[PDB]
Structure formats: C-alpha cells, structure tokens
Amino acid sequence: MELVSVAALAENRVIGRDGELPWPSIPADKKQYRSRVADDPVVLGRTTFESMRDDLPGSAQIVMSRSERSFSVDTAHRAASVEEAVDIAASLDAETAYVIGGAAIYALFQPHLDRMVLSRVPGEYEGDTYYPEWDAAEWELDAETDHEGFTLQEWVRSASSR
C-alpha cells in the first residue's frame, strides 16, 4: 500500500518534551509500536530520531529533513521529500511503511498517509512538541480501542461508497 503515522499525545495534542514522548514507554506503547512498526520501515523527524539513535523502530529508519545522510545503525537512512521517503522504503524490502512523527512530519505527511494511527495518553502537559488537527472529509475512523495508560486510535483516508 503506502505509509501510516504512529504518535502518542495528551492536552493541547502534545507529542512530547525531549524526543517522541515525555513518559519512558508503557508495555502497550512498545508492543502496539512493535506489532505495527517492527517488521515495517518508519519515516520520522530530528525531534523523534535524536531519541531513536538509542531505541531503533523496524526494518528501516527514514528522516524527512535536508541533512547529509549517515546516522548510527545500518537500518538508518534519510528522505528529502514524501516521494524520496516512499522510494527509499520500497527500495529496501516493504509493502507498507509507518511514521513516529512529528514537529514537521505529521504536519507535512497528513494528505499523503494511507492511515493516521494515534495514541490518546492522559496526564496534561505544558507545550513543547505539537500534533496537527483531525477532520471529517480528509480522514474517517478505521479502529478505536483501549490500551495500558492510553486509548489507541486508527484513522483511514476518505473511502468511496455512493
């Protein structure tokens, strides 16, 4: 298919403070992220990647920026656009990819995703890394379910019926 974005967030829709997220990681976060993204390649920022230099996601780790390439693991690589992020994920070996995302990533990828997977986590936070708005004719609800610490949320792009 193509690629699906996977971020976790609270009040003001805050992604996190240090990198991806300000809590360390609950077992439902690192198990839903690993049965979603551990086989599949992930497209992500310098906020989320300056973290994932320690913990890596799946079969590759793509950065949407304009840096020189070459980062830390051999499964870690750099996209210049959405077209360069999809062409590098399909060049390694994959049908779908994912996205942790982003200060810029979810805000640039929103029209180009297969799905917007999200994680609704309580506790209420100050205002550092921000997520985009959600609509009704751009994307519908694929799945809503309860998880350990949060609510899982799967959004699908607009499907034709009548």
Side-chain angles (χ1 to χ4, degrees):
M1 298 196 288
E2 51 245 59
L3 29 55
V4 174
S5 61
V6 328
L9 53 282
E11 182 54 307
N12 245 335
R13 66 188 161 291
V14 170
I15 301 168
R17 280 176 265 174
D18 295 276
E20 54 271 310
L21 38 85
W23 72 79
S25 273
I26 44 264
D29 175 76
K30 212 81 66 170
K31 177 65 181 101
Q32 186 264 123
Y33 145 104
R34 288 189 142 282
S35 283
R36 196 72 64 191
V37 328
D39 252 24
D40 279 41
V42 177
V43 314
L44 67 141
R46 286 294 282 182
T47 320
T48 62
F49 192 108
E50 294 177 301
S51 205
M52 298 241 245
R53 195 190 182 75
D54 233 51
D55 257 343
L56 323 324
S59 212
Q61 198 183 155
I62 289 152
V63 172
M64 278 230 62
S65 191
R66 288 81 136 81
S67 77
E68 288 281 82
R69 323 105 68 260
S70 293
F71 290 128
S72 268
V73 70
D74 289 34
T75 63
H77 298 110
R78 205 280 287 112
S81 66
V82 176
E83 293 155 77
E84 279 99 54
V86 162
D87 270 24
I88 95 140
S91 293
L92 35 107
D93 260 320
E95 327 193 36
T96 41
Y98 287 97
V99 352
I100 307 313
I105 322 301
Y106 254 109
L108 100 94
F109 262 104
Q110 40 110 261
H112 308 290
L113 280 346
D114 188 82
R115 283 136 185 235
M116 281 166 85
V117 171
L118 161 158
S119 349
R120 296 285 279 273
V121 193
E124 298 133 67
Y125 308 155
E126 319 202 321
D128 291 89
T129 319
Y130 280 86
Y131 189 89
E133 58 282 283
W134 43 55
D135 215 291
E138 296 291 53
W139 26 74
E140 104 191 83
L141 234 300
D142 199 46
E144 200 177 70
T145 209
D146 67 286
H147 267 42
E148 303 172 323
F150 67 88
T151 101
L152 170 288
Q153 244 269 19
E154 311 193 52
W155 285 94
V156 62
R157 263 196 74 267
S158 204
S160 180
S161 222
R162 194 171 181 181

Tab-separated table of all heavy atoms in Angstrom, residues 115-155:
chain	number	residue	atom	x	y	z
A	115	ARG	N	-3.004	5.720	6.449
A	115	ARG	CA	-3.786	5.924	7.704
A	115	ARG	C	-3.051	6.862	8.733
A	115	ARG	O	-1.823	6.947	8.780
A	115	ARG	CB	-4.085	4.521	8.318
A	115	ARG	CG	-5.218	3.723	7.631
A	115	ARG	CD	-4.899	2.235	7.397
A	115	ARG	NE	-6.031	1.647	6.618
A	115	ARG	CZ	-6.728	0.594	6.996
A	115	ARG	NH1	-6.245	-0.343	7.756
A	115	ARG	NH2	-7.958	0.502	6.615
A	116	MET	N	-3.801	7.539	9.616
A	116	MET	CA	-3.235	8.282	10.788
A	116	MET	C	-3.488	7.499	12.131
A	116	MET	O	-4.398	7.809	12.904
A	116	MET	CB	-3.808	9.736	10.796
A	116	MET	CG	-3.145	10.721	9.822
A	116	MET	SD	-4.142	12.214	9.633
A	116	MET	CE	-3.599	13.226	11.024
A	117	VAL	N	-2.669	6.477	12.444
A	117	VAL	CA	-2.675	5.794	13.780
A	117	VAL	C	-2.150	6.735	14.930
A	117	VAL	O	-1.071	7.315	14.888
A	117	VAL	CB	-1.889	4.437	13.685
A	117	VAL	CG1	-1.615	3.717	15.027
A	117	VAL	CG2	-2.578	3.381	12.789
A	118	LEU	N	-2.910	6.899	15.993
A	118	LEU	CA	-2.559	7.772	17.137
A	118	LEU	C	-2.823	7.039	18.499
A	118	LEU	O	-3.493	6.008	18.602
A	118	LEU	CB	-3.238	9.147	16.829
A	118	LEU	CG	-3.433	10.119	18.011
A	118	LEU	CD1	-3.590	11.569	17.573
A	118	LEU	CD2	-4.693	9.787	18.800
A	119	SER	N	-2.260	7.600	19.576
A	119	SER	CA	-2.344	7.028	20.939
A	119	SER	C	-2.729	8.174	21.945
A	119	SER	O	-1.943	9.086	22.199
A	119	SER	CB	-1.013	6.284	21.273
A	119	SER	OG	-0.108	6.074	20.182
A	120	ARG	N	-3.957	8.169	22.482
A	120	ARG	CA	-4.501	9.290	23.314
A	120	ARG	C	-4.143	9.109	24.835
A	120	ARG	O	-4.824	8.382	25.565
A	120	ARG	CB	-6.048	9.355	23.118
A	120	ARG	CG	-6.616	9.701	21.714
A	120	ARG	CD	-6.514	11.189	21.285
A	120	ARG	NE	-7.592	12.044	21.849
A	120	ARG	CZ	-8.787	12.224	21.293
A	120	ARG	NH1	-9.208	11.579	20.238
A	120	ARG	NH2	-9.580	13.086	21.835
A	121	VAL	N	-3.063	9.738	25.312
A	121	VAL	CA	-2.431	9.417	26.634
A	121	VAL	C	-2.781	10.536	27.682
A	121	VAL	O	-2.332	11.665	27.469
A	121	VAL	CB	-0.871	9.251	26.476
A	121	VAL	CG1	-0.221	8.620	27.733
A	121	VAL	CG2	-0.375	8.441	25.243
A	122	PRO	N	-3.517	10.336	28.817
A	122	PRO	CA	-3.791	11.445	29.784
A	122	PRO	C	-2.570	11.977	30.630
A	122	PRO	O	-1.401	11.701	30.329
A	122	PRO	CB	-4.990	10.883	30.591
A	122	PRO	CG	-5.574	9.763	29.732
A	122	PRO	CD	-4.354	9.147	29.052
A	123	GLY	N	-2.839	12.798	31.660
A	123	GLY	CA	-1.761	13.470	32.455
A	123	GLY	C	-1.567	15.000	32.297
A	123	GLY	O	-1.176	15.640	33.272
A	124	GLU	N	-1.793	15.549	31.089
A	124	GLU	CA	-1.924	17.021	30.832
A	124	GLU	C	-0.566	17.824	30.865
A	124	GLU	O	0.096	17.932	31.902
A	124	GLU	CB	-3.100	17.667	31.633
A	124	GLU	CG	-4.530	17.123	31.308
A	124	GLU	CD	-5.427	16.763	32.485
A	124	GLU	OE1	-5.834	17.666	33.243
A	124	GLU	OE2	-5.761	15.568	32.637
A	125	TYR	N	-0.075	18.305	29.699
A	125	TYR	CA	1.356	18.733	29.522
A	125	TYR	C	1.530	20.246	29.105
A	125	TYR	O	0.585	20.903	28.658
A	125	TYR	CB	2.071	17.790	28.494
A	125	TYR	CG	2.046	16.248	28.648
A	125	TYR	CD1	2.213	15.476	27.493
A	125	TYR	CD2	1.775	15.597	29.860
A	125	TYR	CE1	1.995	14.103	27.527
A	125	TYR	CE2	1.544	14.225	29.890
A	125	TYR	CZ	1.626	13.484	28.718
A	125	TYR	OH	1.219	12.175	28.714
A	126	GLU	N	2.756	20.795	29.229
A	126	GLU	CA	2.999	22.272	29.139
A	126	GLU	C	2.849	22.898	27.705
A	126	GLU	O	2.006	23.782	27.507
A	126	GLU	CB	4.352	22.652	29.835
A	126	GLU	CG	4.708	21.952	31.187
A	126	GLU	CD	5.694	22.616	32.137
A	126	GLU	OE1	6.694	23.209	31.691
A	126	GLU	OE2	5.494	22.481	33.360
A	127	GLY	N	3.647	22.468	26.712
A	127	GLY	CA	3.524	22.967	25.308
A	127	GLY	C	4.810	23.033	24.466
A	127	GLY	O	5.181	24.114	23.999
A	128	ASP	N	5.426	21.873	24.232
A	128	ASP	CA	6.763	21.780	23.571
A	128	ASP	C	6.634	21.252	22.099
A	128	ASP	O	6.667	22.051	21.157
A	128	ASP	CB	7.702	20.959	24.503
A	128	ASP	CG	8.084	21.656	25.804
A	128	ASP	OD1	7.342	21.501	26.799
A	128	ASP	OD2	9.119	22.355	25.836
A	129	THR	N	6.457	19.934	21.875
A	129	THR	CA	6.247	19.361	20.509
A	129	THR	C	4.715	19.240	20.202
A	129	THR	O	3.982	18.634	20.987
A	129	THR	CB	6.928	17.967	20.366
A	129	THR	OG1	8.211	17.921	20.982
A	129	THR	CG2	7.174	17.517	18.920
A	130	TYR	N	4.222	19.760	19.064
A	130	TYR	CA	2.755	19.807	18.766
A	130	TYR	C	2.321	18.890	17.569
A	130	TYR	O	2.977	18.816	16.524
A	130	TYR	CB	2.350	21.284	18.497
A	130	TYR	CG	2.135	22.152	19.750
A	130	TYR	CD1	3.217	22.800	20.344
A	130	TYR	CD2	0.853	22.341	20.276
A	130	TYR	CE1	3.020	23.652	21.431
A	130	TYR	CE2	0.656	23.193	21.365
A	130	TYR	CZ	1.741	23.839	21.949
A	130	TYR	OH	1.555	24.654	23.039
A	131	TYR	N	1.157	18.240	17.722
A	131	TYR	CA	0.494	17.430	16.656
A	131	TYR	C	-0.504	18.271	15.750
A	131	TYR	O	-1.081	19.251	16.248
A	131	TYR	CB	-0.206	16.278	17.444
A	131	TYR	CG	-0.824	15.135	16.640
A	131	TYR	CD1	-0.060	14.007	16.304
A	131	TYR	CD2	-2.153	15.175	16.248
A	131	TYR	CE1	-0.648	12.971	15.592
A	131	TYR	CE2	-2.710	14.190	15.453
A	131	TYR	CZ	-1.951	13.065	15.119
A	131	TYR	OH	-2.576	12.019	14.485
A	132	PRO	N	-0.805	17.928	14.455
A	132	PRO	CA	-1.871	18.610	13.669
A	132	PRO	C	-3.341	18.318	14.111
A	132	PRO	O	-3.654	17.328	14.772
A	132	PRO	CB	-1.623	18.113	12.227
A	132	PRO	CG	-0.351	17.276	12.262
A	132	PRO	CD	-0.189	16.818	13.708
A	133	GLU	N	-4.266	19.175	13.697
A	133	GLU	CA	-5.726	18.900	13.777
A	133	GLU	C	-6.240	17.634	12.980
A	133	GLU	O	-5.630	17.162	12.015
A	133	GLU	CB	-6.477	20.214	13.408
A	133	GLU	CG	-6.196	20.866	12.012
A	133	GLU	CD	-4.890	21.644	11.917
A	133	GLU	OE1	-4.830	22.781	12.427
A	133	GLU	OE2	-3.899	21.090	11.395
A	134	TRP	N	-7.383	17.089	13.422
A	134	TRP	CA	-8.126	15.999	12.709
A	134	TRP	C	-9.490	16.513	12.129
A	134	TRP	O	-10.175	17.329	12.759
A	134	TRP	CB	-8.293	14.733	13.612
A	134	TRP	CG	-8.687	14.920	15.097
A	134	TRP	CD1	-9.816	15.613	15.595
A	134	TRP	CD2	-7.888	14.685	16.203
A	134	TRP	NE1	-9.721	15.843	16.987
A	134	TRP	CE2	-8.507	15.271	17.333
A	134	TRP	CE3	-6.574	14.156	16.297
A	134	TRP	CZ2	-7.810	15.354	18.563
A	134	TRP	CZ3	-5.907	14.261	17.517
A	134	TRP	CH2	-6.515	14.833	18.636
A	135	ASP	N	-9.876	16.019	10.939
A	135	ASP	CA	-11.088	16.490	10.215
A	135	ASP	C	-12.135	15.329	10.015
A	135	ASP	O	-12.144	14.318	10.727
A	135	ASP	CB	-10.575	17.202	8.918
A	135	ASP	CG	-11.441	18.397	8.513
A	135	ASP	OD1	-12.601	18.189	8.083
A	135	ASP	OD2	-10.982	19.549	8.651
A	136	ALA	N	-13.073	15.516	9.077
A	136	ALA	CA	-14.119	14.507	8.738
A	136	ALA	C	-14.233	14.083	7.238
A	136	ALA	O	-14.570	12.927	6.964
A	136	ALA	CB	-15.450	15.068	9.278
A	137	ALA	N	-14.014	14.987	6.265
A	137	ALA	CA	-13.859	14.592	4.835
A	137	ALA	C	-12.415	14.252	4.334
A	137	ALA	O	-12.305	13.476	3.381
A	137	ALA	CB	-14.541	15.679	3.989
A	138	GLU	N	-11.339	14.765	4.952
A	138	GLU	CA	-9.953	14.254	4.738
A	138	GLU	C	-9.725	12.753	5.208
A	138	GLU	O	-9.221	11.921	4.441
A	138	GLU	CB	-8.983	15.244	5.436
A	138	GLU	CG	-8.878	16.717	4.934
A	138	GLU	CD	-8.249	16.976	3.566
A	138	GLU	OE1	-8.682	16.364	2.564
A	138	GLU	OE2	-7.350	17.839	3.481
A	139	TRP	N	-10.111	12.408	6.455
A	139	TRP	CA	-9.909	11.056	7.069
A	139	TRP	C	-11.122	10.629	7.982
A	139	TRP	O	-11.608	11.408	8.806
A	139	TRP	CB	-8.526	10.904	7.800
A	139	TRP	CG	-7.816	12.155	8.368
A	139	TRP	CD1	-8.174	12.888	9.523
A	139	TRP	CD2	-6.879	12.942	7.715
A	139	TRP	NE1	-7.453	14.105	9.611
A	139	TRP	CE2	-6.703	14.136	8.457
A	139	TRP	CE3	-6.293	12.804	6.432
A	139	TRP	CZ2	-5.966	15.213	7.913
A	139	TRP	CZ3	-5.568	13.878	5.916
A	139	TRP	CH2	-5.408	15.063	6.642
A	140	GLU	N	-11.584	9.373	7.834
A	140	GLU	CA	-12.589	8.722	8.729
A	140	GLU	C	-11.906	7.854	9.870
A	140	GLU	O	-10.684	7.682	9.913
A	140	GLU	CB	-13.639	8.002	7.805
A	140	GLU	CG	-13.581	6.454	7.650
A	140	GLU	CD	-14.465	5.886	6.549
A	140	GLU	OE1	-14.049	5.872	5.372
A	140	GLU	OE2	-15.587	5.438	6.864
A	141	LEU	N	-12.686	7.300	10.814
A	141	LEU	CA	-12.158	6.390	11.876
A	141	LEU	C	-12.091	4.897	11.371
A	141	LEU	O	-13.135	4.271	11.155
A	141	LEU	CB	-13.064	6.576	13.140
A	141	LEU	CG	-12.394	6.915	14.495
A	141	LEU	CD1	-11.382	5.863	14.981
A	141	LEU	CD2	-11.748	8.311	14.509
A	142	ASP	N	-10.887	4.320	11.214
A	142	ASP	CA	-10.682	2.858	10.977
A	142	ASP	C	-10.955	1.966	12.252
A	142	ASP	O	-11.797	1.062	12.215
A	142	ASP	CB	-9.241	2.715	10.406
A	142	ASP	CG	-8.915	1.418	9.667
A	142	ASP	OD1	-9.704	0.946	8.817
A	142	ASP	OD2	-7.801	0.894	9.865
A	143	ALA	N	-10.275	2.231	13.389
A	143	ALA	CA	-10.453	1.475	14.658
A	143	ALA	C	-10.262	2.366	15.937
A	143	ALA	O	-9.312	3.140	16.028
A	143	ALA	CB	-9.443	0.304	14.638
A	144	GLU	N	-11.123	2.235	16.960
A	144	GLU	CA	-10.904	2.883	18.297
A	144	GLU	C	-10.844	1.778	19.414
A	144	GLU	O	-11.792	0.995	19.558
A	144	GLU	CB	-12.003	3.966	18.531
A	144	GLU	CG	-11.617	5.024	19.607
A	144	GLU	CD	-12.599	6.158	19.864
A	144	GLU	OE1	-13.682	5.906	20.433
A	144	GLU	OE2	-12.253	7.324	19.562
A	145	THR	N	-9.740	1.673	20.187
A	145	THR	CA	-9.611	0.636	21.265
A	145	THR	C	-8.829	1.125	22.536
A	145	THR	O	-7.932	1.973	22.461
A	145	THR	CB	-9.126	-0.739	20.688
A	145	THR	OG1	-9.658	-1.764	21.508
A	145	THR	CG2	-7.611	-1.021	20.561
A	146	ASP	N	-9.142	0.572	23.721
A	146	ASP	CA	-8.443	0.904	24.994
A	146	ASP	C	-7.064	0.159	25.182
A	146	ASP	O	-6.923	-1.031	24.878
A	146	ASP	CB	-9.459	0.745	26.159
A	146	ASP	CG	-9.991	-0.649	26.498
A	146	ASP	OD1	-10.823	-1.183	25.732
A	146	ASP	OD2	-9.619	-1.192	27.561
A	147	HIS	N	-6.019	0.878	25.640
A	147	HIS	CA	-4.650	0.308	25.871
A	147	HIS	C	-4.076	0.724	27.281
A	147	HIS	O	-4.633	1.553	28.009
A	147	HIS	CB	-3.748	0.705	24.651
A	147	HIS	CG	-3.671	-0.305	23.494
A	147	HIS	ND1	-4.743	-0.993	22.980
A	147	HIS	CD2	-2.511	-0.660	22.779
A	147	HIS	CE1	-4.127	-1.756	22.028
A	147	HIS	NE2	-2.775	-1.637	21.826
A	148	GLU	N	-2.938	0.131	27.698
A	148	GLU	CA	-2.376	0.322	29.073
A	148	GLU	C	-1.773	1.759	29.274
A	148	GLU	O	-0.704	2.057	28.745
A	148	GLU	CB	-1.295	-0.761	29.368
A	148	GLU	CG	-1.677	-2.269	29.254
A	148	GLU	CD	-0.519	-3.256	29.370
A	148	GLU	OE1	0.593	-2.973	28.871
A	148	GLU	OE2	-0.733	-4.347	29.936
A	149	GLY	N	-2.454	2.667	29.995
A	149	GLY	CA	-2.052	4.116	30.021
A	149	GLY	C	-2.725	5.106	29.025
A	149	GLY	O	-2.621	6.314	29.235
A	150	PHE	N	-3.354	4.635	27.936
A	150	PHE	CA	-3.844	5.487	26.808
A	150	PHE	C	-5.085	4.892	26.045
A	150	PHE	O	-5.626	3.842	26.398
A	150	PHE	CB	-2.618	5.803	25.887
A	150	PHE	CG	-1.975	4.648	25.107
A	150	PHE	CD1	-2.444	4.286	23.850
A	150	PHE	CD2	-0.879	3.969	25.646
A	150	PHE	CE1	-1.854	3.246	23.133
A	150	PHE	CE2	-0.288	2.928	24.938
A	150	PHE	CZ	-0.763	2.573	23.683
A	151	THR	N	-5.533	5.557	24.964
A	151	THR	CA	-6.536	4.989	24.003
A	151	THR	C	-5.880	4.910	22.585
A	151	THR	O	-5.571	5.938	21.971
A	151	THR	CB	-7.949	5.688	24.015
A	151	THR	OG1	-8.139	6.599	22.930
A	151	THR	CG2	-8.355	6.474	25.278
A	152	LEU	N	-5.684	3.703	22.026
A	152	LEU	CA	-5.367	3.541	20.572
A	152	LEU	C	-6.526	4.053	19.643
A	152	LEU	O	-7.723	3.981	19.940
A	152	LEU	CB	-4.889	2.078	20.341
A	152	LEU	CG	-4.682	1.469	18.923
A	152	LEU	CD1	-5.986	1.181	18.156
A	152	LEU	CD2	-3.725	2.249	18.001
A	153	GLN	N	-6.096	4.634	18.533
A	153	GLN	CA	-6.933	5.394	17.578
A	153	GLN	C	-6.342	5.120	16.154
A	153	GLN	O	-5.199	5.485	15.902
A	153	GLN	CB	-6.843	6.895	18.014
A	153	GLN	CG	-8.184	7.526	18.474
A	153	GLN	CD	-8.986	8.204	17.363
A	153	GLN	OE1	-8.819	7.985	16.174
A	153	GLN	NE2	-9.837	9.134	17.694
A	154	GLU	N	-7.055	4.468	15.236
A	154	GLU	CA	-6.593	4.262	13.829
A	154	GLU	C	-7.502	5.117	12.893
A	154	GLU	O	-8.704	4.878	12.824
A	154	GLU	CB	-6.517	2.755	13.436
A	154	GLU	CG	-5.768	1.813	14.422
A	154	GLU	CD	-5.415	0.423	13.926
A	154	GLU	OE1	-4.804	0.289	12.849
A	154	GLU	OE2	-5.569	-0.549	14.697
A	155	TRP	N	-6.969	6.129	12.193
A	155	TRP	CA	-7.755	6.956	11.214
A	155	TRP	C	-7.479	6.484	9.734
A	155	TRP	O	-6.311	6.429	9.357
A	155	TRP	CB	-7.320	8.444	11.369
A	155	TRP	CG	-7.797	9.257	12.583
A	155	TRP	CD1	-7.106	9.436	13.807
A	155	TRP	CD2	-8.897	10.093	12.661
A	155	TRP	NE1	-7.742	10.383	14.641
A	155	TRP	CE2	-8.876	10.730	13.928
A	155	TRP	CE3	-9.918	10.388	11.721
A	155	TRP	CZ2	-9.904	11.625	14.291
A	155	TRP	CZ3	-10.925	11.278	12.096
A	155	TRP	CH2	-10.918	11.886	13.362
